[PDB]
Write a protein that binds this ligand. Structure first.
Ligand SMILES: Nc1ncnc2c1ncn2[C@@H]1O[C@H](COP(=O)(O)OP(=O)(O)O)[C@@H](O)[C@H]1O
Ligand SMILES: Nc1ncnc2c1ncn2[C@@H]1O[C@H](COP(=O)(O)OP(=O)(O)O)[C@@H](O)[C@H]1O
Ligand code: BEF
Ligand SMILES: [Mg+2]
Ligand SMILES: [Mg+2]
Ligand SMILES: [Zn+2]
Lengths: 48, 175, 96, 204, 633, 97
């Protein structure tokens, strides 16, 4: 139950039920992006 | 470098306890939730869902709990114009083809509509005709002809009119 | 992990009006009616920081409910970048 | 409410809702068929008064509807006992309950299949029958309207012809026949007489 | 730093432009037009061109897929090639910009389906414009002047939006002093400013799911694309779906995402603010004139409006005249004379009053449909937002130079009709409320439908008790029609065959039992003359898009003028209408004289005549007599 | 669907009918109901499911509740010579359930 959520459940997979009352707008995140030094002009590729 | 990066989308949902299963004079407890990639745009507000995800902690000494979404077990919800299968498996299609050829299917559907309700035979037949609906047509000049059948029930109370309407919504695709 | 202790039947009963100041830092027994519950929030108990130069989580530190230990001087690296709390490594306690 | 009624007028017949609030202008789509149940103007409708008086709805609203089912709770002891026994059997009597009843889910999927696969058209010989019956019905209603000073509370207009055509096409779609049949027309007219023109006949 | 890939893309696009000479011809036409405009002074078309992406796909699949998938590396080469072509053509001693039309495959989306997977890809979004920012200038080059040296210094600015590829961030510092410390005086009027406007596009209400919150995207327009839309329009904006900013990745929840604007298309739709302009080919113009040379051209056109509707011939003629409209007179001193024809239909239930209105809504160049009680006097006219205190244009203001189709006119509140008085007659909307004193301009023609008060038009009582409307309001309406559903066996029969023939109508390519699918028909604002199927079964019936073309041509090209023969006919008809009592369905005012003149002018328009003759005045008088007296010859 | 100004978030709160999903709902001053309250009472008593369509939330909450109601006759006193219809302002569809 949503009221029964406990600190012992932190970082553990939890099964629970409820009602969806609000869905925010899609926000784009980064999964792979290419960067550059303003000085070195050194390309790089971070993966998240 | 934005023209070379690759992005994925994130959507924030907020879950609330079922409104009836709450303490009497207490605001229902709601919990902020997050999903991403193909789990985005999978639910609409008001849907009753079951959630599999990681209970987590977010700092704004105290901390704010929230759940990463791993899977959304969306229950059966209201059937809307968009929320419909529109796709029939083969066996279902042949079964419907067999049913359409039955000679008494008109009587079966008359018997199938509100079978607990006694009498009102022609009313049930008219209900069946309403559920089928006529033909929707569009004249070349833009004129549109009615392709729906609207029926009025008018009588003394206790004639099961409300129950018949409830049956009609329970059987119809969208109501 | 830890056993907490319950104390009952405190002979002194003080209503909310007469707390004044002399009752600070002392055990007090009060009566009243509950108005609002703020819910359950997991409170840090066994906090595990880490340093950017370390690359690993530091040894767990107890955090009493006075104020958390915002470390500014790394024990190992002496670096000013130890501000990071890793979730599942820290032990949390219910706070309402 | 009146503000709802004015919108329901267009929705039932033009199958659309027009909105022109300040700043937003659009014509939404409401392609639905409405089934309405209502008590008469009084708690019980008395034929002792003028039978046009027990019909609370105006001529245009009744013109929208494809039929008006005037149902009366008659006072037959045998029929009342029949209803009571039916109710007891249904209400945990377990005297009920193959092949004569289609489940709700199966019937709903059949409804979807019928609506989405086929949409019949009238046969050319059905048109003559429909026109003849429509003209005869209008002339009979004119006979009544000459007989009675009050105009018929339930009107028969071109919308009634549309209703009969739509019922015939509905039956043909039910039978999954791409062409509407004469038997379909006869059944539709039978329903029309049983549904409308008896409410009209009940009124002066 | 010249690059080989850039040069190769440039030469490939130059080959493409050389292959399809139409774009070359258009560029030449733009250049010669601008030169001619400069010649007359001893408007300026923008340096833009529309590319059909389909032709590019046919010509070069690789380059097409490159534009669609990675426009950052492909659009600038194309723009450089086009600029080179323009410079080479302009042998006579500001780069050109590129625009796209055609099919976008899976990139044609709505604001709801703009998932992040479409970023950095040329998308074509369709929706409704909710907010439009003010058109502000943007500083791109700043010319300064050193008072001591006497030399003009300049600097060029840039930002992430104005270029597709990410440039190295150079902070924008305004030069206050010379390199040698001399003071600089900024030279406005020599520095360059570019118009910049941001608009928000929201999911179209027609296609949006009902009962759910809408989704919106922000569009950045620039230079010639600014102020091409009005809030509430339906648009098809195409441009790169760029993402901007560090997006919080740099230490201070996603990335700022917006659609850089390449092209904006005002999409015409049913009951919206945008009109629908039909391209008139020379073939179309010749056909229009030839059909105008016909004798019963008025009858042919009028019968072409609602073939599926039997009868109501006079109502159809009135609607045709209303669509054509009369000329507007603005006297030198300043006074205004109404030049529109209003029509009111009062009749029994199921006499087709609404279907005619819906036809007018679907066929007029600019029409807006409203119902009575649902739309208040705030919905009509205009309203003040109070949010600072901006004006929200209502139904009648949006329908300027158009048609307003009001349904259930009887039901609409008395206060609403009080509001509609001035709009119907003076063709202005005055606010003068809450410190906002403006006079909005709403020159629209109104057509309405109302049931008679007693549910049906009972001829036993006088017209006044059945109509149940103020006399002034009825005076506003140019033509008032009363239609009664009367029982007649011959008429009932004929109606029956007509309706039955309409119901058994087959589309050109549909199966007998196939269900007909509807389409939204979002026409883009900018086959034979007659129709194969006539439901009434010889007078030819014209194809309805051809009727729209005819109406557009007549409204634009021809402006009739009154002539003495007509003046006399209209004067005599007005006099004997006013001085003779026949229990008219409407009272007679000077508005009836104006109506006679306006109908005569509209009829002259229908014949494509620069002058009004006796026949037009006779037609107008007969139509008005049928309207009022209820009788004809 | 109301937002608490201090915390600034939406909450879906059902009526007393929804809260008493599997219990009783005691409605005092039954005659003195608002129009919205009367409509909600009628919906709960007829279909046992309150439906909500505000702020993007389109769902039908469940309310299967037994109603114990107290109401006052018109004029603060029951007139015996009148039927039940004239004694109480509630309309017949409300009472019939
Ligand atoms: N003909 C009937 N057959 C079966 N049950 C009936 C019939 N008429 C009434 N009922 C019963 O009465 C109720 C339906 O009447 P109701 O829906 O209240 O009518 P109304 O539409 O006039 O309000 C249900 O409990 C139903 O089981
Ligand atoms: N003269 C007519 N010719 C063809 N169809 C007609 C005619 N009169 C009525 N109808 C049909 O009857 C229906 C009612 O028309 P509608 O415009 O809704 O009536 P109302 O005048 O009540 O608004 C429509 O389906 C229309 O096609
Ligand atoms: F019955 Be109608 F829409 F005047
Ligand atoms: Mg009922
Ligand atoms: Mg109408
Ligand atoms: Zn360290």
């Amino acid at each position: 139950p949503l009221r029964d959520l406990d600190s012992e459940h932190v970082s553990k997979i939890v099964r629970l039920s409820g009602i969806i009352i609000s869905t925010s707008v899609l926000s784009s995140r980064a999964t792979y992006l290419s960067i550059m030094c303003r000085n070195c002009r050194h390309t790089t590729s971070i993966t998240i | 470098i934005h023209e070379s990066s690759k992005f994925i989308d994130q959507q924030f949902l907020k879950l609330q306890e079922i409104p009836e299963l709450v303490p009497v004079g207490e605001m229902p407890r709601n919990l902020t939730m997050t999903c991403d990639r193909y789990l985005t745009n999978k639910v609409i507000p008001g849907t009753r869902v079951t959630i599999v995800g990681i209970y987590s902690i977010y700092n704004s000494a105290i901390r704010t709990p929230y759940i990463k979404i791993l899977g959304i077990q969306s229950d059966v919800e209201t059937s809307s114009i968009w929320n419909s299968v529109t796709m029939f498996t083969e066996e279902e299609e042949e079964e419907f083809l067999q049913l359409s050829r039955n000679p008494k299917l008109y009587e079966i559907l008359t018997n199938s509509i509100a079978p607990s309700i006694f009498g009102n035979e022609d009313i049930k037949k008219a209900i069946v005709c309403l559920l089928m609906g006529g033909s929707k047509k569009i004249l070349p000049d833009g004129m549109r002809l009615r392709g729906d059948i609207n029926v009025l029930l008018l009588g003394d109370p206790g004639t099961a009119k409300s129950q018949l309407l409830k049956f009609v919504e329970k059987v119809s695709p969208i109501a | 992990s830890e056993i907490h202790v319950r104390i009952s039947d405190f002979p002194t009963i003080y209503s909310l009006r007469e707390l004044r100041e002399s009752n600070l830092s002392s055990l007090v027994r009060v009566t009243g009616v509950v108005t609002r519950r703020t819910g359950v929030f997991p409170q840090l108990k066994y906090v595990k920081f880490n340093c950017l130069k370390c690359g690993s989580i530091l040894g767990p530190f107890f955090q009493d409910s006075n104020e958390e230990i915002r470390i500014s001087f790394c024990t190992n690296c002496k670096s000013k970048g130890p501000f990071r709390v890793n979730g599942e490594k820290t032990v949390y306690r219910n706070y309402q | 409410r009146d503000e709802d009624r004015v919108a329901i007028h267009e929705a039932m017949e033009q199958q659309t809702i027009s909105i022109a609030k300040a700043g937003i202008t659009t014509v939404l789509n409401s392609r639905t068929s409405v089934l309405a149940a209502a008590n008469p103007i009084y708690g019980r409708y008395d034929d002792l008064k003028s039978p046009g008086d027990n019909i609370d709805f105006q001529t245009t609203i009744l013109s929208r509807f494809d039929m008006i089912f005037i149902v009366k709770d008659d006072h037959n002891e045998e029929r009342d006992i029949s209803i009571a026994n039916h109710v007891i059997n249904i209400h945990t009597g377990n005297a009920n309950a193959n092949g004569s009843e289609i489940s709700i889910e199966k019937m709903k999927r059949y409804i979807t299949y019928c609506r989405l696969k086929c949409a019949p058209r009238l046969s050319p010989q059905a048109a003559e029958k429909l026109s003849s019956n429509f003209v005869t019905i209008r002339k009979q209603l004119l006979i009544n309207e000459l007989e009675s000073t009050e105009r018929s509370s339930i009107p028969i207009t071109i919308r009634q012809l549309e209703a009969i055509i739509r019922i015939t096409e509905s039956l043909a779609k039910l039978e999954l026949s791409p062409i509407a049949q004469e038997r379909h027309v006869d059944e539709a007219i039978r329903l029309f007489q049983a549904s409308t023109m008896d409410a009209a006949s009940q009124d002066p | 730093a010249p690059d080989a890939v850039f040069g190769d893309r440039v030469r490939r696009f130059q080959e493409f432009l050389d292959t399809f000479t139409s774009y070359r011809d258009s560029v030449r036409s733009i250049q010669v037009y601008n030169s001619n405009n400069a010649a007359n002074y001893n408007n300026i078309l923008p340096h833009r061109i529309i590319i059909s992406l389909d032709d590019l796909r046919e010509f070069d699949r690789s380059f097409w897929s490159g534009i669609l998938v990675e426009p950052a590396y492909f659009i600038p080469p194309a723009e450089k090639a086009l600029t080179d072509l323009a410079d080479s053509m302009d042998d006579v001693p500001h780069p050109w910009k590129l625009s796209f039309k055609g099919s976008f495959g899976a990139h044609a989306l709505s604001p709801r389906t703009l998932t992040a997977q479409h970023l950095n890809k040329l998308v074509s979004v369709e929706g409704i414009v909710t907010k439009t920012s003010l058109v502000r200038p943007k500083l791109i080059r700043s010319v300064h002047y050193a008072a001591k040296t006497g030399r003009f210094h300049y600097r060029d600015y840039t930002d992430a939006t104005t270029t597709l590829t990410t440039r190295i961030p150079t902070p924008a510092i305004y030069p206050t002093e010379d390199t040698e410390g001399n003071k600089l005086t900024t030279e406005y009027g020599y520095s360059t400013f570019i118009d910049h406007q941001r608009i928000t596009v929201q999911e179209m209400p027609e296609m949006a799911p009902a009962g759910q919150l809408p989704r919106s995207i922000d569009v950045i327009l620039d230079d010639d694309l600014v102020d091409k839309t009005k809030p509430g329009d339906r648009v098809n904006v195409v441009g790169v779906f760029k993402s901007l900013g560090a997006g919080g990745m740099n230490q201070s929840i996603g990335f700022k995402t917006l659609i850089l604007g390449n092209t904006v298309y005002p999409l015409h739709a049913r009951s919206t603010g945008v009109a629908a302009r039909q391209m008139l080919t020379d073939f179309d113009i010749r056909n229009i004139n030839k059909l105008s040379k016909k004798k019963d051209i008025f009858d042919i056109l009028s019968q072409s409006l609602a073939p599926s509707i039997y009868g109501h011939d006079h109502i159809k003629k009135a609607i045709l005249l209303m669509l054509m409209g009369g000329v507007e007179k603005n006297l030198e001193n300043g006074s205004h004379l109404r030049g529109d024809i209003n029509i009111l239909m009062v009749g029994d239930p199921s006499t087709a009053k609404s279907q005619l209105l819906r036809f007018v809504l679907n066929t007029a160049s600019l029409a807006i449909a409203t119902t009575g009680r649902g739309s208040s006097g705030v919905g009509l006219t205009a309203a003040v937002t109070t949010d600072e205190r901006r004006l929200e244009a209502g139904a009648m203001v949006l329908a300027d130079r158009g048609v307003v189709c009001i349904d259930e006119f009887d039901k609409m509140t008395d206060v609403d009709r009080v509001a509609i008085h001035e709009v119907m007659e003076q063709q202005t909307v005055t606010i003068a409320k809450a410190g906002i004193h403006t006079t909005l301009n709403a020159r629209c023609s109104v057509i309405a439908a109302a049931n008679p008060v007693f549910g049906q038009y009972d001829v036993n009582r006088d017209p006044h008790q059945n109509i149940a409307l103020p006399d002034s309001l009825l005076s506003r309406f140019d033509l008032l029609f009363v239609v009664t559903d009367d029982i007649n066996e011959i008429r009932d029969r004929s109606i029956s065959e007509h309706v039955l023939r309409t119901h058994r109508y087959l589309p050109p390519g549909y199966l007998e039992g196939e269900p007909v699918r509807e389409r939204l028909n979002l026409s883009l604002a900018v086959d034979h003359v007659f129709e194969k199927f006539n439901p009434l079964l010889i007078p030819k019936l014209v194809t309805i898009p051809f009727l729209r073309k005819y109406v557009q041509y007549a409204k634009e090209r021809v402006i009739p003028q009154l002539t003495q023969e007509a003046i006399n006919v209209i004067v005599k008809n007005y006099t004997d209408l006013r001085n003779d009592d026949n229990t008219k369905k409407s009272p007679i005012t000077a508005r009836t004289l104006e109506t006679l003149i306006r109908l005569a002018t509209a009829h002259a328009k229908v014949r494509l005549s620069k002058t009004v003759n006796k026949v037009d005045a006779k037609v107008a008088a007969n139509l008005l007599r049928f309207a009022l007296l209820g009788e004809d010859i | 669907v109301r937002k608490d100004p201090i915390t600034k978030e939406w909450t879906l709160e059902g009526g007393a009918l929804v809260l008493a999903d599997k219990g009783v709902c005691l409605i005092d001053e039954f005659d003195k109901m608002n129009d919205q309250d009367r409509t909600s009472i009628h919906e709960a008593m007829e279909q046992q499911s309150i439906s909500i369509s505000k702020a993007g939330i389109v769902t039908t909450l469940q309310a299967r509740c037994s109603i114990i109601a107290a109401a006052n006759p018109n004029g603060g006193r029951y007139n015996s010579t009148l039927p039940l219809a004239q004694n109480v302002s509630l309309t017949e569809p409300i009472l019939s359930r």
